[PDB]
Amino acid sequence: VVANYENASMAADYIKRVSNVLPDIGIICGSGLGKLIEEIEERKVIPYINIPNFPKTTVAGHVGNLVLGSVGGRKIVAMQGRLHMYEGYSNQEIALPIRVMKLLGVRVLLITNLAGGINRKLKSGDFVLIKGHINFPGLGLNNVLVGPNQDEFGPRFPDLSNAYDRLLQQLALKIAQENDFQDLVHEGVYAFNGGPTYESPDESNMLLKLGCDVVGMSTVPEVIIACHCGIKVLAVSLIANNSILDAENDVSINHEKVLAVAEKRADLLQMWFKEIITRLPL
Amino acid sequence: VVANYENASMAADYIKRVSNVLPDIGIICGSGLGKLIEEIEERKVIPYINIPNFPKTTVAGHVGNLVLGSVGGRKIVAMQGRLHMYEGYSNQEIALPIRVMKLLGVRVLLITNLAGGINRKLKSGDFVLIKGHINFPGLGLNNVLVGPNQDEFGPRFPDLSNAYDRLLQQLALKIAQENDFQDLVHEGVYAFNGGPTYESPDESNMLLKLGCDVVGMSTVPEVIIACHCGIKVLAVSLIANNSILDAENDVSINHEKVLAVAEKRADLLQMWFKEIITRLPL
Amino acid sequence: VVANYENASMAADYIKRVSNVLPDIGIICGSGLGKLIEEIEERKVIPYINIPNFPKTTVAGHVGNLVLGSVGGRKIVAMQGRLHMYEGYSNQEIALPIRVMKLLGVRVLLITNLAGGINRKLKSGDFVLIKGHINFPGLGLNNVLVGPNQDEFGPRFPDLSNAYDRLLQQLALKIAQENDFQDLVHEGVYAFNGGPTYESPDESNMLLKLGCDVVGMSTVPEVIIACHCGIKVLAVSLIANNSILDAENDVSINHEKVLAVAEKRADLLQMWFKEIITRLPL
Ligand SMILES: O=C(O)[C@@H](O)c1cc(F)cc(F)c1
Numbered sequence A, B, C: 001v002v003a004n005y006e007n008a009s010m011a012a013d014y015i016k017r018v019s020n021v022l023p024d025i026g027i028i029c030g031s032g033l034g035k036l037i038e039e040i041e042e043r044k045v046i047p048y049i050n051i052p053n054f055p056k057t058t059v060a061g062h063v064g065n066l067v068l069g070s071v072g073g074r075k076i077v078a079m080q081g082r083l084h085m086y087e088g089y090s091n092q093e094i095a096l097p098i099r100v101m102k103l104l105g106v107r108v109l110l111i112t113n114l115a116g117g118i119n120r121k122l123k124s125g126d127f128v129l130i131k132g133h134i135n136f137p138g139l140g141l142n143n144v145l146v147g148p149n150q151d152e153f154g155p156r157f158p159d160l161s162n163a164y165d166r167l168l169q170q171l172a173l174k175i176a177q178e179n180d181f182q183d184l185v186h187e188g189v190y191a192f193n194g195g196p197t198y199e200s201p202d203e204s205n206m207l208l209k210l211g212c213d214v215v216g217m218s219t220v221p222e223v224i225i226a227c228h229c230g231i232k233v234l235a236v237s238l239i240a241n242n243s244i245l246d247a248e249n250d251v252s253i254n255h256e257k258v259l260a261v262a263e264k265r266a267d268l269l270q271m272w273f274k275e276i277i278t279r280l281p282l
């Protein structure tokens, strides 16, 4: 199924007929970082499998719902169970849910992920406001926009120089200062490793040479689809480890260590994003 | 349809039966840079859609013709409307028209494109004679030759060290000096960004570190297919902008700015390539 | 055909019913470097085309057999004719033979390849023990594990930091010292160029900047599938040329020069790997 105007419109029509919520803000939350979704007010939970033209996710399994409702007085739509390109989803499958958000009225997209630290200032448990990226799949002919352009959503050749909204970064930092956790908050450049293997020790050393501050396996495809169709983005990485230190000390990483860091910062990230939602403009 | 000997032969047979021209030189022209094609003498215009085994291009639309005739007393064949890999065309679709040129008798291929400047000496409106490349899709398992080798055209493992003919670069520069525009002409290394998003500001900074002089979304696939089957190449980039300056000053790019630079240099590029065609050997 | 538990099990059942050998060690040998296979004791040769669910290889042609028997008193299984991703084989086709080795009992995988030298200490005819890698296809969304995870074999997010076993590297070097050819043996970082074009001169210069010691078109996909399912790896490159010197002197490479280097070192590599097999643990 192509992520075109007609197909996105059919999905949006279904959602509107079931939901009654017209959302202004969209959220996509990293693994272990989804507690905010279960606290959306006056919720409507819509399984992906019930929505016309949504991608099939039964091979991977696990949760996959669209959740609509209110947070801090604002109308929102959340993806509960996100689609990652290392699972084998196509460009068209990643793009369709973001384009449905656009047709529903979304103007701002908030994203979190788990990532590895490259910059030597980064510790496990730190947050990084993403200010730009290095897209190795895009340089290598696997950009999420490879294929025909869908003209109704955006231009053939997008400019990504303002993909990460500056004012939203400023608002996130201001709220951290108000609650005295600004010592955990950095800004940086995100490298997209297609995955699913963690970056090797020698790949980590290369990324340091190339000016990368953090590395992960998500987020950039969604940012590009959002920027193409005029949706503003705030993207925040939670740092699971410093891969450069681990390479120097011959120390291993694993998904269990990652999820324990997620549990340690989950409640603070929830509180932070609730206040960002309450206060952001447009 | 595979870009094999039998399929390329059927297309060449059709073209010969319609055209009567046996071309020695092939041309592929960048967007906004095609005025020379409309001035080919005693032309025959052949829509792609009429040629056996040519790739289907109706999803993208817009022009797609093969044009045969004479320029400066030489017999040529031009592609009017080129195929780019960011549109989703396969390896086999890109390669078949170049292999048809080979079977028709082409010995030299001349190529132009629009590109972004990385080297700090490059200004909007400058020309760059390409002397080598960095192929991010090829390093990343999306080389145009991935698949079975077509032995009738070339070897399994090509050497690209002389893909950009030195004497043709010398002839292009000599003609620029004769007409006193050599101050616009540079040489450099081309980075292939698969696209279709312009390189991000942080990707631009990385390319500077890695020794790239210009960046664009075309040309390298055609160069590799030509080199594989023994066709000599001259490739010239027209610089639309300096991406490193734009990153330092937080300035945007777009396809409209690119096309205005094309219009500013179109007539001079036309005159230059007409004289190159008239004078080149083999 | 997916490289899943059921499909790998059917292939293993066939092999066991024909072979009677339960191997502990697997070998994959580079082009021109396969003489050891023809000296396996009490051999059983099994054409790939006869084994349930093995990948189809008739488009490329040439040899494709699984060979089981004894070397130095150890039970082994060899791939005679390996599958390379530049031929167009999918992730699933590369992975299935390694997962069949796992089900047959393999605990150690020994690999050789031909490669280009980047580090200035490397000469034609030298050997490099691989200690880590830079996986350009993996960074670029063409990792061999992209797709659903096969949970019976390994985790969703593997750590590659110990993919190249340290003790096996130590054993290989010790045997070189015993036979007084340690002056030919180095260690280094391998860059995976998807291929099939040799790295361009300017790509070679980039790889030097990025800390790569050697570059080639194989090995990393097999290493990753082996590491995912808990098989220990030793990987050795035979250096055909120094690509950095060739770029400075404008000297060409070709498959014929590569194969002549293979012939020069074939008998010594055979003797070396026979002794490694005899002596390795686990
Ligand atoms: O604090 C507030 O809510 C405003 O003053 C504000 C809004 C914003 F989008 C960014 C800010 F840095 C600050």
Ligand SMILES: O=C(O)[C@@H](O)c1cc(F)cc(F)c1
Pocket (backbone or CB within 6 Å): B167, B168, B170, B171, B174, B279, B280, B281
């Ligand atoms: O000017 C001419 O036409 C020849 O002298 C010439 C031909 C060429 F291929 C390259 C040159 F630099 C010069």
Ligand SMILES: O=C(O)[C@@H](O)c1cc(F)cc(F)c1
Pocket (backbone or CB within 6 Å): C167, C168, C170, C171, C174, C279, C280, C281
């Ligand atoms: O020489 C032998 O066989 C053992 O002493 C040995 C075994 C090994 F796996 C690695 C070694 F460096 C040495």
